[PDB]
């Protein structure tokens, strides 16, 4: 909460293999404003990413 989500920073040191967005188009993420943002993180095997 209370921060600008400028994801251009991740371009230098991140390489994501699977990026899927549901309910929103990935090209519209630069114009929107999100409420009640939560980040869930965990580690699984390669076959259960799907």
């Amino acid at each position: 909460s209370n921060c600008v989500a400028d994801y251009s920073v991740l371009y230098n040191s991140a390489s994501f293999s699977t990026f899927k967005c549901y309910g929103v188009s990935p090209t519209k993420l630069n114009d929107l404003c999100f409420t009640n943002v939560y980040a869930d993180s965990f580690v699984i095997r390669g076959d259960e990413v799907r």
């Binding site: 371009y11 230098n12 990026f19 188009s25 990935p26 090209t27 993420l29």
Partner: protein, 49 residues
């Protein structure tokens, strides 16, 4: 990222596809020809724009 309606450094600053595209995108791994033991620095990409 080579697909209509995608984000990322490639689709934003390097190569963008139109939303109405007729055609096929074909890709295959080339690690046996485009990789060197010390590294291959001949391939470039645009990171800032």
């Amino acid at each position: 990222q080579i697909a209509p309606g995608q984000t990322g450094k490639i689709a934003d600053y390097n190569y963008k596809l139109p939303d109405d595209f007729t055609g096929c995108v074909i890709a295959w791994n080339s690690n046996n020809l485009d990789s060197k033991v010390g590294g291959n620095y001949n391939y470039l990409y645009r990171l800032f724009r």
